[PDB]
Design a protein around this ligand. Structure first.
Ligand SMILES: O=P(O)(O)OC[C@H]1O[C@H](O[C@H]2O[C@H](CO)[C@@H](O)[C@H](O)[C@H]2O)[C@H](O)[C@@H](O)[C@@H]1O
Ligand SMILES: O=P(O)(O)OC[C@H]1O[C@H](O[C@H]2O[C@H](CO)[C@@H](O)[C@H](O)[C@H]2O)[C@H](O)[C@@H](O)[C@@H]1O
Ligand SMILES: O=P(O)(O)OC[C@H]1O[C@H](O[C@H]2O[C@H](CO)[C@@H](O)[C@H](O)[C@H]2O)[C@H](O)[C@@H](O)[C@@H]1O
Ligand SMILES: O=P(O)(O)OC[C@H]1O[C@H](O[C@H]2O[C@H](CO)[C@@H](O)[C@H](O)[C@H]2O)[C@H](O)[C@@H](O)[C@@H]1O
Lengths: 460, 460, 460, 460
């Protein structure tokens, strides 16, 4: 093809209209200097595969049938790999037909990439749905420079080894010149896996942050291994949260809640990895114990619907919704719930207004690759108000140490911490938020993307 | 003893202070002409059995241990008889130890009654927990005139026959001179049961309302069988609902709900017989179909906690609470649920204010002996506003035919009917409420009690 | 058409080859004197509707699609009517699409019948899947004489009234000149239903067995209502069970079981109405209590697979299979289970050999229209050996009073009774079996069929 | 005290009579040269703590109440630590009261040890119930040399970190001079944990088998870390399996099973870690596919009852027992199951006879510290017959590579492997069994115990 920089991801960066923010916006000044392409599925079943010139980008759509989506995406990706890589919170399903479709779809992505990529081009493959693509691509196109970044956690070897296709996934990733993870921990698991399962020679030292890279020796070539913690466009969110309409909506939100003294907020895709049940349990017990005032404190949980065709998620929804009904029936009043729960997509401007209104942000995943909601909250609070309660089991906890960190399995401490955040002095709240903002403003998605691409370019 | 009129019920009519309204108040002008006694359990485990002179009444407390309560009341009564007599909505548990404790406790009630009752006294035994007492009492005291009234439904023979102790329960009831039920249907089941199981000769004709009594021949004596539909102190509730404080609270309730155009109301003890799940299902589907306006219509469900030590009820609570959380997550807004659910006791004055505020009363039991909430709502609406949606499977439906009657199993028609009630013209609403009030004002608890006692006195 | 006697049933009497025994064989000498037809579904989806001359009979196949089977048969029949008519052991599903398909299929059966039936012909409609056909047929063909026989129980009114389409089903049955049930109890429920729901005038007396018929007045015509308890071809089974090959197989069965002293046997379609779980519970507890000898006593349960596409049945299968595994793990030995359980169809000659081998026949339904397995066992034991343990909640219990009758809900007595049957003296066993055989040999399927047809002919 | 060598374990080595084999027998020639003591709970609630001189040993009983057992053993040990350390197959319960009792009981063991231990004595603490004892003991008695061996797996850090008391457990283990695990993998997890959680300086190299030890620097002292894979008294089992009575019982077992051509055998404590469900699933599917002959092949599963008061285990038992009943109902014949399942303790001589009779040993844990059943089978087959199917997720798989190794999550390969083992040539079977026996005969419990004690003595 005629593109010298190519991104490969499960989805095209569109909604059709181009998706705002995220990866595609981080790369904007690189596309202004390269002939760029994006390979992905357009998000609707059985489409054409004809290239679309989106001015700054050429889009190469990948055709997936409804059956492909069911077995490669909802199946192998969402119901085999996802629960396994997140510490088997739910039991992975090992299904051979799903594996076979995952292989076929990965090959299709690899072929689309080759079609788009010029000779010697740089290719950046994204995330867990496409772990076979680097090896497949190198076999098709040995001229290419290939990076891979995993956006979800990489599990310990004891769990990874469960996968019947463990060796094929590992060989898949080793097809890259650069394999990156958010955290040194994932990088180190990958190195150990390479030694244990593949018998490759690797470096033994700890892996640094955006530095002190590891290496895997594969025949004549070396695979670089690194940690690059993703972030957001901090400055842009900071600006957006100051808009008059956002601030007026935040005020209106508080009015509609009957002007509570304190608002706790949860914002997540409805997923068992997100620890929404832990928040509700802690809040319920604090109310029972009279440690939170049911008359002036309210918890808002915004759950975005997710993976409805996957049975585990329907069961999760049932459990969360029971907790909500239960807590309100026990501690609410007619015309005044203590928990407001919404199960629907939320426009970004509405989410930002909730960040601005929220006195306590509850981000309590059982396991999460990074979690950008934590960083978005921080970027929105230029008033230095608010408080972030953050699970240690997120990538974000490695950078946001000034937050109120919790082990979500330690319910006693989660409860103590919610009380502490709710009752913090203004000065202490400001001190923490000021320190968190310094980190998030300085370590943004631009720093992340440049660091990964510099590392990848270094493999030439 | 020295009492010529004796009431026997599972509980004493106290809360200690005397319980307002109900049976004990209906009998007030009879106690002004008799030496009256009340036999029952004081509602707290392991108490004395020393008589208490409550001026108008002598109270004879029955001692029950916590173990007695568990096996006779929570066990045999609430988990064997209750589900069986209500068309096995839940599977009855047949437990021999529970039966044996039920026999022992019934004997204890019979002995207390004999202690209190003077020679030739009239005795009125209440309800399903004490079905053995009439026979036990007649054996101890053949001089007594004994009436029994069942407040819950009497099931068809095909279901009743499941009971391993079917014959003992039947012989128990046949110890009375008069056996009464709310409805001719229950009376007719009893007659058929007497023929089928006991082989007694009975009358064959239909049983009337407060008339055309049936009879069972038992050796030399005849048992009278009748239908006496219970009611309320209609005039008293009518007066109470007009008080300024009630009306001001009803207005405040509507304000606290954000001034909806329409309020649907459910008021029940949390029980699987009450069809609360049907209301929530119908309401959810109407919202899905856009047939109810989620912006100006709200459903308030007040569930009084019940039988928490009985497993079936904990499961029911879980199911209802899931539905509540689900419906609000799908159709609510932050600061504005479509369903307000409270699981706690409610003071009577607060309940009356909710009756006055409610545009639609939802009384949809799967099976109910009478249901007095339906009649209380009617008595409270002297403004002739509101609408009553009423299950056919209540005793009340036999008298309140002007209500919007529903088969709760016919969900399509339950939904059609809720829409009809919500959108009725003012005139049509008034016509129905006027007719319902004529019935309820004329057929009150005084008429009921006098009719039963006249019938009983007739057996002398 | 050209047939003066027409049978209408859900299935054609074939397997293709003609089905042995049953109804079709009982009618053999009537078909030798009439021009007979049989209307039914050939048991395979989407077939022709072309008549088949089977010599003694003309077969009129009814076309049903797989979707028809799912919604009319597996749906409305097996998952609405079946659980409702059997005392809601499982919760009926009320589904409007199922009802609509049930109506359409019933109309199709009615149209096929009209096509086959000559002028003034006699029509005999069978069982609960076709309850609308008599009214539909009378509207199409007022010249026809129409009988209907219900082979399953007719439930009490309190349960029947749940059905949203209660009135349509009732009007459906009232289209017949004769409505028959196994038992007077079902007939009496039907009479009461007719008065309560339809407001028709009926007879009030008890209904006799094959006599003392009830009546329902419907405008100008009278519907006859009777009880006709079905039976088997007793003499034929008696002969078959004496064959040398049967007796040798029975001996071999005992040898293969390691020559136990006592064999208990259960034979049923796998259905929640059959009380298989009760047998296993009783047997397990008797073993725990040391009241049955685990070294010389064995229980064989032959469950024929049934209704696999209906969820309730998959759950039932799971529960039964757990009990089997549990009891063997607790009381068996390697090479020697105490329970042998087979989930597969069994050839009739093999079933007869099991009847001959079995010391105790366990027929313990929670609710059953008649149950012919009980009568078949009796007819097979011309040696006068064996023992029949029989639930009171079967139609058979009304005729087989000499059996060991049990209330399956009374587990203590079920256990006492199994011990009694296992340890009965030879003489007492013979006395009971002799009396049971006198009843079953004299009251066979020929007597049943002639009694119903005589009653029907009487309506002309 | 007056003992210079002290063993500390949850249970005393008794049954009272001294327990045969195991640890206590491995140490017999050391006790012949030392003044030895054993500290443990005598296995019955609320006992004395008075020392018992068992000739070769002094026994120091630890008093545990029934409540102690419930919260320290059944609670924290069996329902927190056990599932966590075995890759959270079941969700651990994090309970603070359980933790507090675990601390108190561990202190009680530490105090008993100090009472028994002479100055400068060597102490060997066993297994996961007593992980706090080394630190507690060092604080009480800094003069002691302390070893700890973990008999179950040590989980990856990502899972271990869930524990609210992660730091206290880690500090607990670091109180030892020597910490040992079966496998280098566990040792390496421990080293990484020490760096990540405690911030201690550790060695970075791979850990060897009984060599190349790791180290953790704790202030002035160094903790040695090693891998010592446990084994059995191979020679003793080899002799015992040759006894005439054992061989005659093995023959009788095959006769009682109706002389099958092939017997598969499972022997385990009933635990969710043991993968019994996987064996049954594979066997069921092989029968469905006609790849195993249901007429000449039989599977015997001997499950020893375990942890009945722990809810997870009652659920597991239910699931296994359903599978057993299901497979026999589908593929068995009357008098001939394909699966024989026994849930009861089995005498050791009977177990050995089953090892000798079994053509295929199925040892398929999802996760297991070592699993000695695999090695016992090998030691019993001096005839070189049989075949061992072994999960990779056992410690045993690191030494028994000549077995048929399986990933139990790869059901297709488990099935292929069972077929391969069942149909192996005599010569190939012998080749594998010969190689397995060479390993197991040379690497016995004596080698294991001496290696650990040599390492520990080296820390002086
Ligand atoms: O559901 P799919 O389409 O498979 O996507 C998974 C998940 O991907 C992103 O989350 C992950 O990446 C971000 C950014 O690196 C991390 O912050 C998260 O911790 C990862 O889980 C999306 O943000 C998610 O919406 C999406 O579900
Ligand atoms: O829970 P227990 O103490 O056993 O009491 C049952 C029930 O008794 C009353 O309800 C019944 O009687 C009334 C009056 O006749 C009828 O309207 C109901 O339909 C019957 O169920 C009480 O009102 C209930 O609170 C109580 O639960
Ligand atoms: O499953 P379907 O096809 O709907 O048939 C139901 C049932 O019909 C028969 O049983 C019923 O009739 C007999 C004879 O009158 C009675 O003895 C039973 O008690 C009734 O249930 C068949 O025998 C059954 O196999 C069939 O399932
Ligand atoms: O149930 P508890 O009393 O807590 O004991 C657990 C377990 O201990 C032993 O098994 C473990 O150690 C052996 C020997 O090292 C290993 O082979 C196993 O893999 C470990 O699980 C006993 O053998 C078990 O009976 C016991 O349950």
């Amino acid at each position: 093809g005629d593109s010298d920089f190519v991104v490969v991801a499960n989805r095209l960066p569109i909604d059709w209209k181009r998706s705002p923010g995220g990866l595609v916006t981080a790369l904007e000044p690189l596309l202004r200097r390269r002939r760029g392409a994006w390979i992905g599925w357009p998000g609707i079943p059985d489409s054409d595969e004809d290239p679309i010139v989106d001015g700054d980008l050429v889009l190469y759509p990948v055709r997936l049938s409804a059956d492909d989506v069911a077995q490669y995406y909802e199946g192998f990706s969402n119901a085999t790999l996802w629960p396994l890589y997140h510490d088997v919170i739910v039991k992975p399903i090992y299904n051979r037909q799903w594996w076979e479709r995952y292989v076929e779809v990965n090959r299709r992505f690899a072929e689309a990439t080759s079609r788009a990529a010029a000779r010697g081009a740089t290719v950046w493959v994204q995330d867990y749905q496409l772990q076979l693509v680097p090896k497949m691509l190198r076999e098709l196109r040995p001229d290419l420079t290939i990076g891979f970044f995993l956006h979800i956690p990489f599990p310990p070897v004891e769990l990874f080894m469960q996968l019947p296709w463990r060796t094929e996934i590992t060989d898949g990733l080793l097809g890259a010149d650069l394999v990156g993870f958010h955290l040194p921990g994932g990088a180190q698991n990958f190195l150990f896996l390479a030694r244990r399962l593949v018998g490759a020679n690797t470096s033994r030292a700890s892996v640094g942050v955006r530095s002190k890279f590891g290496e895997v020796q594969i025949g004549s070539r070396t695979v670089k291994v690194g940690a690059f913690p993703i972030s957001i466009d901090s400055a842009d969110l900071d600006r957006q949260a100051r808009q008059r309409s956002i601030r007026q909506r935040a005020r209106q939100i508080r009015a509609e809640l009957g002007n509570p003294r304190r608002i706790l907020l949860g914002v997540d895709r409805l997923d068992y990895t997100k620890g929404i049940d832990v928040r509700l349990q802690a809040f319920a017990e604090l109310l029972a114990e009279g440690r939170v005032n049911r008359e002036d404190t309210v918890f808002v949980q915004l759950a975005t619907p997710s993976r409805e065709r996957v049975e585990a998620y329907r069961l999760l929804r049932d459990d969360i919704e029971r907790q909500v009904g239960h807590i309100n029936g026990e501690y609410g009043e007619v015309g005044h719930p203590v928990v407001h729960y919404l199960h629907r997509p939320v426009p970004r401007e509405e989410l930002i207004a909730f960040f601005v209104a929220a006195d306590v942000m509850l981000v309590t995943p059982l396991r999460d690759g990074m979690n950008l909601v934590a960083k978005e909250y921080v970027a929105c609070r230029s008033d230095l108000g608010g408080a972030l309660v953050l699970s240690e089991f997120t990538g974000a906890a490695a950078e946001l140490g000034q937050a109120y960190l919790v082990n979500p399995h330690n319910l006693d401490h989660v409860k103590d911490t919610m009380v502490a955040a709710l009752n913090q002095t203004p000065e202490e709240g400001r001190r923490r938020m000021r320190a968190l903002r310094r980190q998030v403003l300085a370590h943004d998605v631009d720093l992340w993307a440049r660091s990964f691409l510099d590392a990848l370019a270094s493999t030439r």
